[PDB]
Amino acid sequence: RKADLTGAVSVVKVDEIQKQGENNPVKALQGRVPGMNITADGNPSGSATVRIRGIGTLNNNDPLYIIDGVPTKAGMHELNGNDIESIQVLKDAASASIYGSRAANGVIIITTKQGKKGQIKINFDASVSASMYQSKMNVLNTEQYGRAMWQAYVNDGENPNGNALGYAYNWGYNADGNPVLYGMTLSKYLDSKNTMPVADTDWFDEITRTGVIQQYNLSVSNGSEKGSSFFSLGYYKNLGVIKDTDFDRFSARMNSDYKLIDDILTIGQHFTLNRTSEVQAPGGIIETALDIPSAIPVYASDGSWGGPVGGWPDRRNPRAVLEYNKDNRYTYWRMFGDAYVNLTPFKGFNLRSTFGLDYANKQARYFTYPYQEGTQTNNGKSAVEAKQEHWTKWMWNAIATYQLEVGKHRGDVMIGMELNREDDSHFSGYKEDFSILTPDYMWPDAGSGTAQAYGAGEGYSLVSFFGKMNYSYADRYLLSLTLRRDGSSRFGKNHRYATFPSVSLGWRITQENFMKELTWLDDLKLRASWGQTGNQEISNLARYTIYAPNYGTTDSFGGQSYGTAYDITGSNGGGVLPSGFKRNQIGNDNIKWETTTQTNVGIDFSLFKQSLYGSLEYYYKKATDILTEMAGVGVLGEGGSRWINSGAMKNQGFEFNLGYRNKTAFGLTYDLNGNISTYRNEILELPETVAANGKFGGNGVKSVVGHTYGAQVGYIADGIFKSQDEVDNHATQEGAAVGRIRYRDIDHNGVIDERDQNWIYDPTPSFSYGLNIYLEYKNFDLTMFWQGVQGVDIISDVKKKSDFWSASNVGFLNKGTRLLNAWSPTNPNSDIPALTRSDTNNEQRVSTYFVENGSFLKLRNIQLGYTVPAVISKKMRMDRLRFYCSAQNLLTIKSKNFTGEDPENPNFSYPIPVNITFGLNIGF
Amino acid sequence: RKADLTGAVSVVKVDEIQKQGENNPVKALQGRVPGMNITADGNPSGSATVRIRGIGTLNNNDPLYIIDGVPTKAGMHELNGNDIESIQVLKDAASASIYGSRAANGVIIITTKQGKKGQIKINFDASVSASMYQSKMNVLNTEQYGRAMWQAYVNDGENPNGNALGYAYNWGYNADGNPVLYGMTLSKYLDSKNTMPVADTDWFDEITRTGVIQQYNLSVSNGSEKGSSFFSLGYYKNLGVIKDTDFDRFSARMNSDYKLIDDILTIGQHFTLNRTSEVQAPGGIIETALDIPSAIPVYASDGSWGGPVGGWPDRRNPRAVLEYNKDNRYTYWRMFGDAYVNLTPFKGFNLRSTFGLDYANKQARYFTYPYQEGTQTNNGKSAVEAKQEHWTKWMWNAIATYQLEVGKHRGDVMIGMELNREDDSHFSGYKEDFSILTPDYMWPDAGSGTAQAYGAGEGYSLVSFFGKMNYSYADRYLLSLTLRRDGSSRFGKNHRYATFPSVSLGWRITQENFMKELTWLDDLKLRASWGQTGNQEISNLARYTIYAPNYGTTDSFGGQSYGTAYDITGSNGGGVLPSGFKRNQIGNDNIKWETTTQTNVGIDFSLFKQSLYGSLEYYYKKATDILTEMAGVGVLGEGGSRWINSGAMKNQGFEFNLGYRNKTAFGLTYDLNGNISTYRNEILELPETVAANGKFGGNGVKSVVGHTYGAQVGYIADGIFKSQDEVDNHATQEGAAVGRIRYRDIDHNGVIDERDQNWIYDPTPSFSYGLNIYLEYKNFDLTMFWQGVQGVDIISDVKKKSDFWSASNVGFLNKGTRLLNAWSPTNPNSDIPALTRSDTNNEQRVSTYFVENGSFLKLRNIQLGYTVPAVISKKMRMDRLRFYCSAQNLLTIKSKNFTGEDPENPNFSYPIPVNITFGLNIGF
Ligand SMILES: OC[C@H]1O[C@@](CO)(OC[C@H]2O[C@@](CO)(OC[C@H]3O[C@@](CO)(OC[C@H]4O[C@](O)(CO)[C@@H](O)[C@@H]4O)[C@@H](O)[C@@H]3O)[C@@H](O)[C@@H]2O)[C@@H](O)[C@@H]1O
Ligand SMILES: OC[C@H]1O[C@@](CO)(OC[C@H]2O[C@@](CO)(OC[C@H]3O[C@@](CO)(OC[C@H]4O[C@](O)(CO)[C@@H](O)[C@@H]4O)[C@@H](O)[C@@H]3O)[C@@H](O)[C@@H]2O)[C@@H](O)[C@@H]1O
Ligand SMILES: [Mg+2]
Ligand SMILES: [Mg+2]
Numbered sequence A, B: 001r002k003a004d005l006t007g008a009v010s011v012v013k014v015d016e017i018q019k020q021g022e023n024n025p026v027k028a029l030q031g032r033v034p035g036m037n038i039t040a041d042g043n044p045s046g047s048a049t050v051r052i053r054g055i056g057t058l059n060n061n062d063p064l065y066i067i068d069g070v071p072t073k074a075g076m077h078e079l080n081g082n083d084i085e086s087i088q089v090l091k092d093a094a095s096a097s098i099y100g101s102r103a104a105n106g107v108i109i110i111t112t113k114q115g116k117k118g119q120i121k122i123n124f125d126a127s128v129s130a131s132m133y134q135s136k137m138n139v140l141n142t143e144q145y146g147r148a149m150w151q152a153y154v155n156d157g158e159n160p161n162g163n164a165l166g167y168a169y170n171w172g173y174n175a176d177g178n179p180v181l182y183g184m185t186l187s188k189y190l191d192s193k194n195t196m197p198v199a200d201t202d203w204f205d206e207i208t209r210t211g212v213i214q215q216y217n218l219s220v221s222n223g224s225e226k227g228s229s230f231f232s233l234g235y236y237k238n239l240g241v242i243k244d245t246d247f248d249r250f251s252a253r254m255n256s257d258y259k260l261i262d263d264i265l266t267i268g269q270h271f272t273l274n275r276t277s278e279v280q281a282p283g284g285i286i287e288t289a290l291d292i293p294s295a296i297p298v299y300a301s302d303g304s305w306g307g308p309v310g311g312w313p314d315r316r317n318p319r320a321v322l323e324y325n326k327d328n329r330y331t332y333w334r335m336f337g338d339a340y341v342n343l344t345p346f347k348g349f350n351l352r353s354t355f356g357l358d359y360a361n362k363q364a365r366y367f368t369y370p371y372q373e374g375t376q377t378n379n380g381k382s383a384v385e386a387k388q389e390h391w392t393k394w395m396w397n398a399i400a401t402y403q404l405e406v407g408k409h410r411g412d413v414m415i416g417m418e419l420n421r422e423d424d425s426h427f428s429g430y431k432e433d434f435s436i437l438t439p440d441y442m443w444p445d446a447g448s449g450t451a452q453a454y455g456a457g458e459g460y461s462l463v464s465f466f467g468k469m470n471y472s473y474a475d476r477y478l479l480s481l482t483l484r485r486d487g488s489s490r491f492g493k494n495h496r497y498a499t500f501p502s503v504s505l506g507w508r509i510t511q512e513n514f515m516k517e518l519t520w521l522d523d524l525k526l527r528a529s530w531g532q533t534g535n536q537e538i539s540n541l542a543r544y545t546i547y548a549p550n551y552g553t554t555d556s557f558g559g560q561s562y563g564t565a566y567d568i569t570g571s572n573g574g575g576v577l578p579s580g581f582k583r584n585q586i587g588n589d590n591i592k593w594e595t596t597t598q599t600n601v602g603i604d605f606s607l608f609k610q611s612l613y614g615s616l617e618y619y620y621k622k623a624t625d626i627l628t629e630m631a632g633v634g635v636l637g638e639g640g641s642r643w644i645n646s647g648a649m650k651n652q653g654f655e656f657n658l659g660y661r662n663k664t665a666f667g668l669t670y671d672l673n674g675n676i677s678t679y680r681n682e683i684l685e686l687p688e689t690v691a692a693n694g695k696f697g698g699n700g701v702k703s704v705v706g707h708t709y710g711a712q713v714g715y716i717a718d719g720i721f722k723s724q725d726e727v728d729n730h731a732t733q734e735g736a737a738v739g740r741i742r743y744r745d746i747d748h749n750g751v752i753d754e755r756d757q758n759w760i761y762d763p764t765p766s767f768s769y770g771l772n773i774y775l776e777y778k779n780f781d782l783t784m785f786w787q788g789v790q791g792v793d794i795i796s797d798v799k800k801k802s803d804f805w806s807a808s809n810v811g812f813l814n815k816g817t818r819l820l821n822a823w824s825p826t827n828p829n830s831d832i833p834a835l836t837r838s839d840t841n842n843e844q845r846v847s848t849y850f851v852e853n854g855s856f857l858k859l860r861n862i863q864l865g866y867t868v869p870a871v872i873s874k875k876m877r878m879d880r881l882r883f884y885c886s887a888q889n890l891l892t893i894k895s896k897n898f899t900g901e902d903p904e905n906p907n908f909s910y911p912i913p914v915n916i917t918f919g920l921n922i923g924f
Helices: A014-019 A093-099 A142-156 A203-207 A285-291 A318-325 A688-693 A724-729 A817-821 A870-875 B014-019 B093-099 B142-156 B203-207 B285-291 B318-325 B688-693 B724-729 B817-821 B870-875
Strands: A009-012 A036-039 A049-052 A064-067 A070-072 A084-090 A107-112 A120-132 A167-173 A179-186 A211-222 A227-239 A246-259 A266-279 A329-343 A349-368 A383-406 A409-432 A452-473 A477-488 A497-507 A521-535 A546-548 A582-585 A594-607 A612-624 A627-630 A642-645 A648-662 A669-685 A712-714 A717-720 A741-743 A758-761 A767-777 A780-790 A793-795 A851-853 A856-867 A881-894 A914-922 B009-012 B036-039 B049-052 B064-067 B070-072 B084-090 B107-112 B120-132 B167-173 B179-186 B211-222 B227-239 B246-259 B266-279 B329-343 B349-368 B383-406 B409-432 B452-473 B477-488 B497-507 B521-535 B546-548 B582-585 B594-607 B612-624 B627-630 B642-645 B648-662 B669-685 B712-714 B717-720 B741-743 B758-761 B767-777 B780-790 B793-795 B851-853 B856-867 B881-894 B914-922
Touching: A009 A014, A014 A084, A014 A780, A070 A329, A070 A349, A070 A383, A084 A093, A093 A107, A093 A452, A093 A477, A093 A497, A093 A521, A093 A594, A120 B246, A142 A167, A142 A179, A142 A817, A203 A285, A203 A318, A211 A914, A211 B246, A227 B227, A227 B246, A246 B120, A246 B211, A246 B227, A246 B246, A246 B266, A266 B246, A266 B266, A285 A318, A383 B452, A409 B409, A409 B452, A452 B383, A452 B409, A452 B452, A477 A521, A627 A688, B009 B014, B014 B084, B014 B780, B070 B329, B070 B349, B070 B383, B084 B093, B093 B107, B093 B452, B093 B477, B093 B497, B093 B521, B093 B594, B142 B167, B142 B179, B142 B817, B203 B285, B203 B318, B211 B914, B285 B318, B477 B521, B627 B688
Parallel strands: A064 A107, B064 B107
Antiparallel strands: A009 A084, A036 A049, A064 A070, A084 A107, A120 A211, A120 A914, A167 A179, A211 A227, A227 A246, A246 A266, A266 A329, A329 A349, A349 A383, A383 A409, A409 A452, A452 A477, A477 A497, A497 A521, A521 A594, A546 A582, A594 A612, A612 A648, A627 A642, A648 A669, A669 A767, A712 A758, A717 A741, A767 A780, A780 A856, A793 A851, A856 A881, A881 A914, B009 B084, B036 B049, B064 B070, B084 B107, B120 B211, B120 B914, B167 B179, B211 B227, B227 B246, B246 B266, B266 B329, B329 B349, B349 B383, B383 B409, B409 B452, B452 B477, B477 B497, B497 B521, B521 B594, B546 B582, B594 B612, B612 B648, B627 B642, B648 B669, B669 B767, B712 B758, B717 B741, B767 B780, B780 B856, B793 B851, B856 B881, B881 B914
């Protein structure tokens, strides 16, 4: 039963959601909803990014979740997802407008479990899983690194023995004169102090482990003709594949409802309290592991952490970084409550008053230990940073609803007044100069150095007056009209309030009397909708010209702190310097709501007595007056960025969902749920400065207007040179040589320059599809979910560090294994450019070489279960006893054009492991 | 129904508790429990101090509250007290031992409301009250202040015109030569700059107001044969009589229980969430208001805050202090949850597993605004202090219980394992040098001065193995035996665990067959108990020799920060000085549990068919091996304090409770509940250093061993001198003169010195009593509660500032009105010493003059209510509709020997106002 019945609403089967055994319920439905993309890195937490109906605005695109009627935007990884009874995604503006003023990016409606009338249920779910690291990037070992360095040296024509890295090469020339390597030897110690012995270290294996996931849920549900209740407890723990990274969560939910008199005075509440403790991986840990050469030992001769010495590249020890980061644990208390009262003066009138609260409290204590890894050190700096953050949101809602059933005319009239009110704050203390260097001793009182205090606060409010009218004739013609008047504190008084209408029409064709002979066609419905929604998800301080006293106490990398503190006297400090103010942004009093107009046309069908069901949707979204933060013109200086309504986005999309469930003669019940979706995104208008800086695409070379959001312009790589004749015949370019990348001459001017660039990257897949298969046979249930993406291109940064030598900022870094298969006179059958120590050709430029085909098809979740026969369970007094074994991310298929691995995560983000899970469910 | 039936247990009628309409339920039963003293200052919060059975130890004496089986020690002012169904105070060690290892100071058992089986109830309570400031200290006005100063000047023989305060006196001599004042005049401006005009300011009226108290509670309760639930919402707000001080609290409680199978698997939970926001009064605000003379105007000529100028005494403006303190608001989130599961393998066996959690989160932001009140200033210092505190306690409990009913023998055997685990932390950031000077702008990021970071953490754990055996023969002979094995993390491994036994006997004399002819004697029971309990409420870091790197970043008054930072180079600072460590305390590995042995004998009676009931109890408490923090010997230096088991306290007490309820011929139902209690406290052993410093009594002159806790030694004032002959005849003393205090010569050596001191102060009342009267007549219910204390002495500090002139640290301060009635040749009929500007006689010394009789009898609460007749309520569908008007602290009677006012609060603490409340209860 859809909550709108006349809009683009997707109902997710919650039973299949819990099968995947994911902490985040949103991550579970990664590819089960058409036109809704979920991207998850693979960290122990269930944090993921959601994009509904593509990219719809130049602002925050997270959809508005609704739990028990209370809206929010925080991720669901911090809430217990095992007590959800229904999930509905409202991807249509007309249908989702009535649920809030933040519905521009879509609304996901989540309903929690409630006690079923007249019965009691208890469910205990246990789950133990092992997560294994699968996407192991192949990097050069010691011998391979030496061979690659020798190849680069001989290709450049330099002496390979001058590497000054302890490698001594015995080599010569063949009959054709091409250099050949006979053998290599290494010095025992990398430094003259004999403190860093040479070793063959697998850094990826050193920093990875086999994670353990535990999940225990216990829920009890109570129903009656007269009231109901529900109490759930949950514990989740996930150890990541990366060492010293973990995430655990305790959860307790209590829901209840009471009916007084006979039917009047229905008072209900839903509350949940969660406590999540997490240690996250340091930024660029995978990059650090990939960059550091395998010759560096984990431990030095004296037992301290190993590190680069002499001429080895400056990279920290990833194991040491993980060890020092294991104490950066943060605790997060989440609190989602709601209490509502419903009054019924007579049969058709309802008055609902609702109060919802969301309180979040985050406490963290970060430590900075002194480290000395060879030549890598922080000058013995030890510090503590105690940070506290508070978020407090509350919403009050009043709803008046009237229903009439006059003849064949059904009429629902609803009005509503809503207030939303959010306040955020944070403050932190910073201390230095510690002695014991242990988390027990590192407290700000125990410090003996410079101290810093940081602190800020913000907030906003929203007011909404909405109305909804639904008319039904003969249960065949449906009309819906909703109107919203929304105001926010982020806008000035003149442009505070805005009006948004939406209309929906629906015709149940099967109800018409002219096709009663079509017995096979069980149900057919055609619906259309045209709606407008408002977007105001911008910075709270958007219309003010901000001047802030930035003294410079905040840590900055590179010294570009832009602080306001100058030693005007010239005494080299020694006290409190005079300070001032700096401009952060220029105010704009003409900012108003961004208007997103959505037109949707859908056809729902069901054939063969509800056996073959499905839906087909086509949508057109047009966002105008987009509140974008334009940067300064360049001579406007600091604080030149300002918010302006100068945007325009278009999204044209198709979605198709199908489902076929049927039994078999010998007792097999098969259910197939297929889904496919495609969309095209375009930017029609954009501010000149925004298009110039290329923050939304174009790389600052060409304007992204008229092209897909995020599209990138680069050169075109027409293979590599294989002879001097090819270099001479090709158009002249700097650094052209044998074995170097050849770049196409777009304008045919005879010279390769910055004007020889074109659109090369389009981050829009041709189509994304999913398929769920459920088989039941003799108490055996098998679930198999496949997700595929076709026609998507990806920019690969790992390729830049695997197909080239000395293509990074610093040289002598560790590279990929496939680098060994580079072009050479001895090995002409290769497309990888020849190794070189100098990037004369400038191959780090954006080009089609780094663009790879990201199409993939992976088995997201497979599960085989066994249900104990009812007689044995009744003997053991359990109403339902089930066991199951599942595999998540077990298998994947990728295109041959993708040189790397894991097309879903082709970069240095958190890896996605393979989960092998065993679980049991008891229904006492 | 008592939960022990064989110990000293007092059951408090919760219905009478809610009548007083107090936020703190503990404050409501201030004098309704024998042998239990409640002291409340009168602040908007319900915070109060509880002492059960007198002072029982030299450590923290707060009793252990128990809510829904979870123990705690936090005050109940931060929890909703309107959803309590039963309150039981266990004042006996034997009865309260089984409830925890922290039962040395008594256990208060609080049970929350739960849904009554087979029915639904909703109650809505509204209450609006006005609090009026009654204890207005009478201080001298401008003319009275001038007259008093002139009298002091003429008594001292000096020229009254040299006061240099703008007072010009026209005066002369009478026939007898005694000075007489004819008139006085004042300069218009107190300073030569004409910025502080003279005025007659009533500072007490200026800083006080009429407070408004609002209370709104809404509870719903759900019962069934098969499960139950309860949901309560509450809002409280109290504006104190002192301006810019307030306290509000939101509360939400959800309780539920579910029964599975038939009777096995009973799963229940009780959760409550509270949010209290409070602004407290600054320290010594009443003292500041009393000290500042009335001549100082509230506002200056330019509109700024008025302040002392010229020779006026240095005192801040209390109104300015309150105005600057109005932004020091702290928010406190309290979280008390519990979840339990009960299993019944068969009829007599029960297994209960309980998990309780208490999470408290306090966030505060204090501001230091620059002030310039005449000559009072802070050199334009502006600062912000953002403080965060976290408390997290959790308890796990396992209980196995077996019951047997063999013939007339009833046997209960219970064993239990309990773990308690508490962790506390706090951290704060400090910033300076602000410009706008508003709470919106004062954030640590906006500061431009020196920053400080403070932070600390601590915690402890408790393990308990307890057993309880109850045997009943013929329902006439009762025996109870409990044994506890308790260990704490605050002790070393050798002395970690301790064993505590307790035994209880009971005989129902009325059940014997030899007195069946005594029909009037309905019930009679005689019980005895001997128990031992353990006390370990000490500092967590008690056995460790503490060395801390106190750099000195903490603010200190007077400069005695004892910081560790020295400019060893001699450059007047300019950087980070070298630091070190200092000793905080000396460890003691021999510390163990403090053993409190309690012997109780009680007689319970009920006569005339449960019409005249009552109880009489006698108790003897002996605490030995008391963990006391002895100070250093004096040459041991800093950190010489250490914890040692060298204490011994004795408490001998009597309690008597009586109750008589009966109807009348014409339809009047009268119920009287009287209570009386008395106790004597003594200290038998004490460390030599502790007795020398006199922290527990004696004022450092004589050892408190063998005397009451808190007893004070001082001189004896034998009136005042009235002639030179009296001075000559009396023993010689320094400063002796006409009109000065005469001090008794205790040792008869002819000279008054420091050896002429004796025990003068004993802080133990002769007896404390209470009386509750409840009258019902024709839908009119009248409640009247009186509380009286007799035989208590109080040290008065207000008297020192009201009966003497220039008796404070600084001169020319404002004094009390009764100072005008001082002894003089013109007014010989007075006992107040003559005014003087020099304290030559040293009348500030501790003496019997400042000891006053604190006996009082006050009407704590009176309430008149009207209940709507049942027919009208049934017409309006309400099951019960009631209105009421009440007065709290309306009337009091004090002894004539008490010169001041409000004997309950005879000092500069928060005043106790008179509350006039109107409330309604609806039982829809
Ligand atoms: O991130 C910018 C923006 O986020 C806000 C608004 O909620 O708060 C986020 C703060 O969290 C910070 C570090 O403290 O990073 C986010 C990490 O903290 C976690 C903890 O669960 O997330 C917290 C917060 O972000 C979501 O996860 C986003 O959906 C929400 O579910 C949740 O409420 C964790 O998920 C992240 O790793 C940092 O970004 C912010 O201080 C604002 O404070 C801030 O403006
Ligand atoms: O007071 C010393 C001792 O108290 C602890 C242990 O709980 O925490 C008290 C902290 O609160 C401080 C200021 O932050 O003063 C107490 C004021 O805060 C309130 C807020 O409700 O009380 C908090 C805390 O103290 C009780 O009230 C005592 O019964 C408890 O009910 C409640 O848990 C308020 O009542 C007081 O005005 C300060 O004393 C402490 O930082 C320890 O932290 C500390 O060692
Ligand atoms: Mg060209
Ligand atoms: Mg003497």
